[model samples]
Target: LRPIATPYPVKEWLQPKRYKAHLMGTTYVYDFPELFRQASSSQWKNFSADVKLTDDFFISNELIEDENGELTEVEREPGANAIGMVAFKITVKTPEYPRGRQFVVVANDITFKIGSFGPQEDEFFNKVTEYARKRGIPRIYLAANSGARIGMAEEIVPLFQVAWNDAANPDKGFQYLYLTSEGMETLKKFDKENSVLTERTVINGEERFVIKTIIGSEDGLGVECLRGSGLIAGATSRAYHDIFTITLVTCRSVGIGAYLVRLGQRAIQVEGQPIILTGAPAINKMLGREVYTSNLQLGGTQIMYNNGVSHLTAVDDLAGVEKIVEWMSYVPAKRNMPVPILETKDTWDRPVDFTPTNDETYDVRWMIEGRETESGFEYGLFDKGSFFETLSGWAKGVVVGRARLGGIPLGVIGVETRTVENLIPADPANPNSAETLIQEPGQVWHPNSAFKTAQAINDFNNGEQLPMMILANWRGFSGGQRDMFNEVLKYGSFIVDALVDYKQPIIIYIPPTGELRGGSWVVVDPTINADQMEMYADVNARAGVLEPQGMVGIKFRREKLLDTMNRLELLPIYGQISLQFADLHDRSSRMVAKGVISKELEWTEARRFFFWRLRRRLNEEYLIKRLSHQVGEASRLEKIARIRSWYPASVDHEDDRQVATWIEENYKTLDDKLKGLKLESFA
Candidate 1:
């Protein structure tokens, strides 16, 4: 498929005006031309602060044939005169730069009569998408509107109801495409009139009655349009398939429209922009409180960003535009291109000199920037305060969000034990059931962190195509009656199940103290049969079932050790105990021997080793070593079944070589470091 041209341009086409509300400081809105220009520019700069552009950067606006079901090129509205402008397609290339990539920016011009959709706008946007589909163009929707125009596009609306057959059970029944604007309105109409659409149903080879919403009679462009977009976005995300839909939380994105924005590849919002299910006023009314229009519900930065509902929040409008550009760099314009690759001055061979002095509290962000690809060093943080801190006030310990390694899109989950200890706890009564209770003043359930990990992993597993990288260093799931009663197991299981079920490659680095029973390690354990998964531990790092103190306290303390020692006794027993506790170190080592974990390395060389291996796997030119195919007769079905389990339904077959190559590249750096160690021993 050909890549789309980038729409963004450096020289400003339209300038945005800033307005300050009493409470919300400053908010910016673009005039029609400026917003239109932003939609056209090819430049993409994401919150991470990376700049990129694509070869296929094109924005083609066309009229659709309601009668013929085809696209037609015609400009019907005068934008400068500007009473009504329905829709426009802003296409930008993807898969980073140098490699072909693009994305289409489909924005509904709500400024034109509250951005109401008419026959012309609905058909135009829908046809643009259909054209995109035909040419294999990657699509993204930058919607900002109130919703469907009341009376236009009546005959042409049915095209919005995109239908597809279920691959798993084709004969049982066809999966009805989600609601379209027409469908939703029809449903409402039927409900008000107390009428039903009945059809003859065949049951037991005899005629029976079945009811359905009137086909094509519903509003095809209203809430139904957004719902259909959500389904498309979700499905596309899963396979890194033909399209990736992203939404910008520009002015007043509400109702089913908000859901479409939420269920995107990633959502970037302006500071004062609202992206909510029900508007603030409606929510207040539902809560039995009287509120003014001034208090309309808004999905602002404070609420959505930290909750992981929106991936990023811009301090202002320009920042938001910058983010959109950077995000485009990581995604491909088409499936054929590799994500944008960046060449950096920094190399993995760089020494890990910037590591924190305090063992208990290490700055993972430093490690990520210092040792990974050169591009990571160049990239800036999404938010300034805790550049590495994700869900800062809620899930304090683990950091999870999008990042680029050598300019490739990858999800990162890092550990910041010290900083994470400070986030405020969620109320027990909250629907999310985040951390409400405190085990102690210093320790508590970091449910927010766990929730973020689980949700992010779940999103990625379902369809966000980015690879996952975990910087494992955790104490463990918060324990105590409060956590137990809170259903911590269920939440932990969510993370585990997501990691285990994920189809893409995962690489883990167990830095200092990333040891036994840490929630981070357990969540990212390769034993779960994660595809292309590996755990590389540093010598100073500990990877065991339990901490030394905890293990000694549980086993030896009850027997001989308890008689003579206090809390300090745990150290000696764990350090000196032999044979009985041999499994701790030996099992971890055996994992390496058995090719389960790729390697165990010294801390000093860890980062370089990590990137060296990562880069190797990414180089498709190299042939990868394969794991042993021979299996015990009893294990064959189970082994195949395990591999099959990770396969997403969207993917029809497995690429064994891709898997082999990944595994081979993973261990190469460790092998080199080990060889260096061997040379030193000879000296």
Candidate 2:
């Protein structure tokens, strides 16, 4: 953890409101002004979407709304009425940190009517935004709002009254610029080369579009201005950065605010936070009927994750904030520099147990957390209907992503055979409700998810440069209708195409079950000219075109009667048919003889040998530039040379052999890792 320097005066009041920092556990309120103050200036440092405060910032308040159609006056102290208008800020300055810069702003969540937005805060915010724009700096704001100050309209209305009309072009009114020149330049280059921008232009060059204003209290502005700004920000951000803006739907971002947050770059919602297009109570009043919080009415994780609304799902407020920090790393500070990097304890040197079997269930979430180099991970909608999986989710059969391997950015996709059990409820609000369902234990070993994982793998390779790793297992692709309809064929081909079209160094490794005719080989087929792609199976590996039972079933299923009492005896027909081919030793010999796989090995020496071979094959510079290619074709030898250049001396055979031997000796298990099938048991 980094030490906190002397606190800035503006952000000094941002003490946590509740003694307990959770959303459901405490009713802790804070000075809204201070929260916003901190949000405005601290944009670069604390990259979290979910915001929370401790008991140190709590205050009590009440304010009567003067709606008498006359001049409204607010007799307010710091805790008069809690309007929930706290936020955080970040700004740029001299380097006090390794990244060589500083961020400043204010965030005082004082309990003044939940810290509703008033003229003082509004004007301060405007000034801060202006400063960020003029200096070409990226400003980050963390907002937690209930709504605009209803009784304080006198002071608030002026902030919204920005009248900029064009006589020549009547449609052009109130042109609000969001980002700085540097930000615009960063996006411009990304647009030409990186397909970061989309057709909608939500993240347009220089500025992201602003959608519904409720997220930013844009409703304080006139309806026309609100509508236009919404389109501009929403479209610009999406088009330019894929995410025009970001928000944390904390407490209540009601009315227009909800829409704005939804349309922003990325959104993180607390477990029980309401994210409806319209509040159900209000809708019921308008329709003269009662409304229920059922899955049918509004959006939630089930709908959002499926329909592509929210990016990542979190467990609590703390996790939500944690995700925000992780998400910021993927986006640009100004759109030009590389994403921020954190010192990570996790590396490629994970234990073999990282890959568990389907028979024993482990939480995939654990692996996800373990694999991350940062404090946490944030997710987004990777493809149109797919959730962003940082690691070990539906695809434990294969792990794939743009992750740092050995401190270098590389595309990693591998399989771990651990069993996974997920107890998921239909609604986050109703954890133990009847709708709560549990994913069967040990399903992470499903080969079907591996098929779906290929799609995600291909997505990472669309235009970016990153070396790829394939963790091989011999299980075959699932063979059922449910597996077929999920576009398995297309995804399988997609994975293959991604590997073939990849213009960088590629490496392959076979663990316990990775072998020819096995589930792993078909993914990275030797015939595909995966130049730097090589394979070395662990000693427990069962390498063949088919499993023992599969071969036996095909050979003798026709001859044997289904009801035969001695059917199990017929399984040994393969042994009688071809002694060498039926045995693991003979099968490996044949595979090597046929050149279907690269090498066969004992588990003890495989890991070290593979890494050693990898080191000798590449150099330090090559490792750094593993995926640094533009549009071009990369042949097999070219990829090999590139990898070899990455680690010349480190690729020593003796060291690799030692590493391989140590891994096999330590982690090797006696149980058959293969999913053995017995077809003759049909009777």
Candidate 3:
């Protein structure tokens, strides 16, 4: 623990004086010391034994001029000696990670104006990011806030005034008083001083004004306060790629608070806490109805996590912090390095105990652990006890995690077959209820499940830079009316985008009892990233463009191509005929012939096969890099230009012809110029 530079009296420091304010009733609030104590105590208990925590980074002191005219620190802030929000720097060691790694933790104090973001806190947060970036430390934000603070009370008074528009047409009766001469003058001066856009116009002889704020246009005074919140969110987004950013929602996180938490690559929410864009009461007032609701129903872990807005959920604050430390073990402190790998007692040659029996349901963990147990220990294809499952409570049809294979770190994704209960907002008539539950059987992809799969893949590729393996097993996407009404196609497109943008190695495998057909197969096909992708299947696995029943129904009924003159009597014969060919297409050997599957192997040999292929691909990549380095400068330039030309062939654009013509005409000139330059000269 780092000592404070200037300690105050123990009694005064431990217990700060309280202040009282009144809105409708008297409300008492303690100062920063009380809030800081609560936040620090709850979080510090979860750190490792070797951790050293310090809050001195935010020290405040008065400047005094020395004899040489240089400034010196003389007096520091007395009680609750923080300049703004409570922050701490922690250093700790883990089993696999190198020592001396640091993390910066920042949290808002709800006791202070409901943990709202104010001007002073905004500047303080910026400085914290700058410090973390310069030091190359990972940042974790414990966000629990109402939103940005609104400072001016007078600015909103005009919006409350009710006015009748006498000059309006008969159809238009009344409108809210948005602006007056006095208000417009004040707003004009505010716009001029703050460098914002504010415009005024007359509607039915009544003046109206529109003021531009950070998010967009709004008609109000003091809305400029929200501009600061937007700036903070933008700053967080810009720094997310530079460092490992994680946000934990421990309490209510609304409006700007919700945006800030999601700007990072990873977000965790407490079980019952919610992160909503707007409060439910506000929506009720807008709808002009008495709607019964709770925060959990609006933006709870179940809602956001299943929708991909949040990645994980925790039972409490301590669990959230522990998970953060666990996730950080699999990733580098900075973006430029490879993920860490730790040796595990689990052996690579261990035979798997659980086998897919088409009729019996088994936990997916059995495939990794080789044996099932009642102790809640998850075993997977990766190193035993090394798998860190993410989004465990949401979109559970698919399981994603970071784990090790033969002491090598990579990402693993598996599809599970278990019933999941989905919750939706409750009816207005049930004043005491918050939500209703809908149970969905697993082994099928719905809109939420599909969308989350794509988001998980995107986050893994964008953040970790590690190879990925997918355990493919699904019948097809949901074809029910509700599924279509939810816009499943739009969500499925997210998967396509993620696959196309992925630059890492991807391997897809189908086990016994695993079946991929129709739209689901199309999304995960290896051809999406053919250069660095491969697919395999077990001998017992099945696949086709469509199921046998559907195939026969379409060909015989729609095309009327069956042989018998009596089509109704010929249905059974056509169905039997379809089964013969469908069986052929379902064979793993047929998939290999079609170039969709790379190979077919026995179920027991999956572990060894996957390990060997992963190692071999990595070795091949190393050789490719070496060969590229030895190529001639002109050859390298020509290769790059050729690759550029291939992009136009793959995609159709409005200016496709113009782009092709320009590239074709300029290729010779660029190649000729490149011939004069030597790689050795540039080196």
Candidate 4:
């Protein structure tokens, strides 16, 4: 672990309240201001929608009178007495943009009406979301809501009467709710009338009125708030496309708020926070039985996180925000900028200590990241303390995370080489169904793991914009009747689609004792994206159209084997010789000879090789991207052509050493030419 430079000044905190170095471990309730302080280290400015006492564009807190002195409509506070939603321009010091990097934060304070969404606050949400999109920076939404708002229709509440089945026998039931003529006259022009459905039924021998149910007429209730939800939903979709978007659920996220979290694509949920579409009580009441007693039964970590809707889970709000910050550390501060690179003392030249043996089961995680011994952690791949796994709950067969190779950030996909006993839940809609277990075989891509691989790649490509390193080691996709029924091929095709469109350098490494066979190789082959991807194999790694035994069974039958033995006049250890022949065809040397892999590598020396390779790719890509804006594509192409020419060894691709030397020599000249432009492009 890196040393803490100094103690954080808790005493120096300027917020109206004080915070601790730690929080109360027992409860979900948390200090709101502390979340802001913790997220960006005390650098934030409110951009919450402007508010007033009445008829406010952002929040409505109204208590108005009619001509004859009566209530018109009441306030609906999503923010309650205050504004429910808050927006801030938060700045954090990251490794890449260490001077200061800014991102937009729009959060719900549950203190305000349980963080419910009103029309005003929803509108506020849209505004803040677009602002972040316009700036091309990441948008972090801290969601903790009870759902849409229904500010009381107080104007008509006092005068309403419930018509009883029997006047004295009120315990029986009510016929309908009604309002008399005298009271109706005063309430005639109120906005509350728009929210209710009524019929002119004759009551008590008078043509009075009866109210049926609440409908969508009031400005801040029902469908109108949902209308704003739809509006913000579209905004959320667009923001996801153009910029980075993430959501953290600190408490219950009900209804449209739940939709927002999923729509944002990258979501972090606090361990106990329920992201509910509707409360369990409502479901039980509607079902005419109390089947579900807790909200967690409906949308808990067991449900959402495992289902892949929740990308990560944290213990509390502060920890959830910390996860967000750590994730952002792997990404560029904004879209169209270089990915963040850290300066590490963990040398790139050191030989990695971890290795996998043949005919042994091992955690692929330890193969990618070294294991902890009595002394300390040794090497696996990438920089130590730099692996942050996302979507970990969904795909147990595959492990995906943002990690640093040397100081260079890249997305890693490591296969799990063990049996995964996944407890599959019964039907969510069927309250009585019992759970069962499904034991998924590791190293084989299942339907869910395949989708997860594609998703992780596309996400890293689009917004995180990091390169990828796939630790390929699989027998093949599960091709049984059940797996085929689950559309394993469909999800598997998505892997090709993701690789085909990936704009960053992709490194496919078949680790020591690993095999990249058949269907797995077809999806990840460098030919899929020749411009940005390459393939490599460890010295003991193997790649084949089929596993060795599978090939031997088909090609080296008894007759063919006997013919080879007769031709060579070999000793009659037929099985042993045939197996050796099959094994010879699968080695990395044969793969390199056939032009199937770029190079055959030793496992111990992989770190330094991958480090220089990835660093060079990133530096060149960033330089070329910026060059396009500065001098135009034509000039950029010529510059690259000339640089590749200057070093004949770089005819195929410029070496890291060459690029580094060139950049250092011409740094001032290039900086001067690009003086008027911002490093991060804004949309």
Candidate 5:
């Protein structure tokens, strides 16, 4: 009993491993492993195993006296004069992409300064970005922050305020008089030590003396200091054109944090987290209202993802990391190289059943998943299980993803036609389903969906440089008041501008029962970039200026015609005529005849047709390069002229307009020549 009662050593007790530090009169400490584990369970392991972690990159070196009275290099304390932001170069390797790829990961530690970007942190971040750029490696930002640090009153006041010491000349006081007694004394002392009468001026016959400080001028000092962060962030964003840049928002990302994600244009947000420019409290304070809204409500996944500000959302931290891994599979490490193609067992010539029905609604995924046997996965038109959908939860009307076709990587954009659940105003009767609504079956292009689609295409072209395949399938732009008020036209024009500016190969496919009309057609029309563009329509696909009902209403519903038809009791005959007219315009054959669509193919032949066409286009030079080049030039000139026309002074100037008009006319002339040359033969 005495032997068993012996006390164990205190060192053997279970306790968290942590270090404490004091900053600005506050004690700061945390269990290191616990914090690291919370941020990411696997990221730490990956860093330790794969990354050649250089923790000393941002550490300062100072001369110190050794025992022998000689100077030596001494590293500064880890968190002294700097926050806990970290940067490391990692050689990332995965089973999917086994080849070791070099990448730079920068992360902010919320345990320090609330993850604010202080002066030291800013310098460190910039250095890390510069290092990544110079080394030609992908840069990944684990962005979790409250934004740039706001200096305390003690630090900011002295840097900006100026003072006058002459108590006899009270009129020469600072314009901002509100100051603490200590601050006033400091300012007065500064003025007494270095003040000088620089100049004298007369205002309204009164003599005013201009006093200056020998230290420096204070004019615009505050503004210049504020501008530094913006300038640095902007420069970092633009410095590396070759490297793949991605940001993963793990927690609250505010102020400049939001801009960093947007500037990269390749960002993913975690579910339930928010990325906002301004917190709701600040907005409410400015408006003098009680809008105590949560940040999640202000800028949640539903808000930002649908708004096209964020490209994707992950359910959790691990999912976000996994998505990054998958996304990197499609992108090359550098801009000089083409997109990487992963090996797949799926063959190019494998036939897929296309079984879409007009009467019943089906998931777009089923359509994308061409044919699947009972034994295996849903085999898509692309390589099986290769469709890595981005922004999948937001903008349900449109779909975008990276996939492989015959093992070749490409960007896929399609329109979803399934019923989508939505959030609506609260209703008491359906409390469980309150703040929720459901969309109808048709694939109508709403403002958010259109904007997201446009942004996705632009990001693919500008950031990823991946060739795109647009599965055009939309009824038309939403005519609802809500959609119009939301500026659907403005976002729709974004798609137009992106398509016009796109330099990569683009294929527009109108699948069976797909209808491309009006705004939708204009956005994806091959004529925008005919040099690297091609368009095809399934035999049953439809295209027109307007749908049948709309055409009938607009063309035949005039008072004269309607009245005549009604009086003669011949309304049915007019209806028949309208139907026939609609049929003519909606026919794929008509689209082919009018040169709007390059070719008409059957859905059964889609596998062979698309594979061969895309493969050839990717390998060969543009068939109508000269004509398309001229057209692009003409388009550019016309855009410039139109922008200039907005100015009152240039409205009547004919030179710019004439130049644009002449170039367009020349393009048209050459376009006809190319068309006559049977360029369609290539397809």
Candidate 6:
């Protein structure tokens, strides 16, 4: 170790946990202070504030119904472990939050009963989460739990007896499970309502209470905690709908813990951690066999990450927290705030280096997050090293991620240009079940990838509130007998619905040597989102209702080809030239001339063009929306005239570009003017 870094020898700085491991040691951070300190170092830019929700304060009492059918309280104060969870507020240095982002953190403490969720923990979680939502700040949840609590009646367990078929038959099965009258009286004295669950039956002429099924009467335990889990799960779902929410599975999440992680949507799982509905021990016991050995076999990265339940996997807790911070950088500081813009040294006016060819396949990620070449690192469509892909493990055909153009973060969707194997998991119940899943072609939407596309788009529009950019290169949706029977059209409609409801600016760009044909072009056509979406095609891009091969077969038969060859005095070999004529109809120039796309752009001019184009669209939208607050058309036009006063009368206010140009040239002063008039509209 000294030879490598001239530092003292250390075992390891980061270790993935089976239970809970120390941040920089071969031990556990079972102590509250060490755990909080280590978490702050991993997540925050500076550590200053912290708080622990103890049983003394932030408490919820246990309750039971009385004979009157009304709620009755138990002990006014119940002694319990105060180490189930913790809450803190801190700021982190991210791309957007340079001064630091002060948000809320609520993490379960694994040391206390394996971090089971009880009534008190549920109440505490609700309080911290609501505070963050009310403040409109990001909410982070660190899940490490055994899920809902379970309890049993100890007195009943000790006194129960199993009646056999015969006195000498020890190997025979039990006739019934029952308790003596004397023992029943003792149990009744402890809890009367719970005792009512059993029935009085005659066994060998003796009055005994027969046990029907599993029964318990513990307060703050049993099914009541499941109800508590429901409360927190619903609260977190609402949080995702309103603000930025992320959860990290550090150890294991079972039952409701898994639900919480899913409801939060964006999840990062530690490498060794598992998220499941039930532990393997209980599951195996229910199955009456050792079907599964560990939770990893059921809900590890191989299962959850590949199924889109866990969007990312981190090597350790520190790396998981860093992923959360990186995800947050693409969103705003809070809901209703403008998308965070970080000024980058990568100039917006530069041209991209990577370009797709007509016949060759390329990785869409390289075109998103620039690649390294022999000529040093070359910039892609967006800023260098800014693309962070989400749901990358699930659907390979449709690529979704967050990237920056200039410094503006956006939700990016690109088409994958390679075949992918579909690995379907076999059912655990079927002992002989096996998987023989086949493959799906590239640049086409299948049922699963179509669903992924809709999920990604809806997430961005509703929660992240960022602009969207789609690299449109799909040939069409897969419509074979198997694909159609699998409901490809149903999932394909979800994409159209998602885009129709999109509120942010959307740009659909057909890259050079890319194709958008048939139903694929129809679904993403700008007409569906006329007010918010625009389409563009590269000079070398091709788009049409059908591929050139099919187009010529339908439109130009052999007789027409031969007649054209003779009438124009052309060579006999012109019989194959009809395909070229059909190809000409799909060119970008034809698309522009037919008014199918907004403009035909060169591949090299895309970066600078899109940045300003998005800027102008966003600015123009802001101006129109703010002016709409005026009561009538007369008053709105009066305010609009005040806006136009800063520009020359020759400038056309009706044209978005003309108005946007004027606003951009004088934005520093124009912003002050808008703030003065539209006081509540400024972000």
Each candidate: what lDDT? 0.50, 0.41, 0.64, 0.75, 0.63, 0.76
For candidate 2, the TM-score is: 0.48
| Preferred candidate (lDDT higher): 2 or 3 | 3
**Candidate 6's error at 171, in angstroms?**
9.7
For model 6, give the 10-residue run with minimal summed lDDT. Answer: 53-62
C-alpha TM-scores of all predictions: 0.63, 0.48, 0.69, 0.81, 0.67, 0.81
Candidates 3 and 5, the one with greater TM-score:
3
Query: What residue pairs clash in candidate 5, if any at all?
Result: 422-437
- Candidate 6 residue 335 Cα shift, in angstroms, is 0.4
lDDT of 3 by residue, 340-423 (tens): 656657766654446868898887756654464686443456776667778776777787888877666677788788787777
Q: Which ranges in model 2 have alpha carbons more than 4 Å from their true place?
A: 1-269, 274-291, 294-468, 483-506, 513-536, 543-545, 556-683
Q: After superposition, how far is residue 34 of candidate 2 from its true place, in Å?
A: 11
Model 1 spans with C-alpha error above 4 angstroms: 1-67, 72-95, 98-100, 116-136, 147-242, 283-288, 291-298, 358-360, 370-394, 404-409, 419-445, 458-464, 518-522, 562-596, 620-683
Using lDDT as the measure, what is the rank order of every candidate, best first? 6, 4, 3, 5, 1, 2
- CA lDDT, candidate 2, residue 490: 67
Which lDDT tens digits does candidate 1 get at residues 1-683? 21234466322223211222112332222233244345335343332236454434444453335457564545443333132223344443332443334344455655455555555454455555656555555555555656544433343244234234553555766544333444445657555222234444444344433335433343544465544444444543432334555566666565545665665546777767776656656665776655424322345665676556677776665565556655554444554344345534333344555454444544566655543445553222111111222333345455566665434456677765554333344532234656543322222225556676777676543434556677666667777676678787788788877777765567776665445455545666787754457777655555566666566556665545544344443644444663246436534465576674677776665545545555544442122111112222224345445434433455443343344344355556534543444444443
Off by over 4 Å in 3: 1-83, 130-137, 153-221, 280-297, 305-307, 373-379, 425-441, 552-581, 619-683
Q: Cα RMSD (Å) between model 3 and the true structure? A: 11.8
Q: Best by lDDT, which number?
A: 6
Please report how far candidate 1 places residue 463 from its true position, in Å.
6.0
Candidate 4, position 449, lDDT: 91
lDDT of 6: 0.76
Model 1 residue 394 distance off true place after TM-score fit, in angstroms: 5.7
Comparing 2 with 3 on TM-score, the higher-scoring candidate is 3
Question: Per-residue lDDT tens digits of candidate 5, residues 1-683?
Answer: 12344377332122211121222211122222122223332433442455443332122232233466333345543343234466545544432334545566676665576777665566566666766666666777777777877642343335342334463466777533223334334556665323222344444344443434333223222333346458647745674344678888876677667777777668888887788888878877886766546777677886787656777888866676667766877776655355665555677777656557767766666667555658665455676667878877667788898887777677898888876665544522232545656473457888778887887787777646688888898877887887899898998888888887666678888988788988678777887776667898989888888888888888767575677566766667777777777767788888888887878988766766676666554432222234344433345345344334433563343343343343444545544655654544344
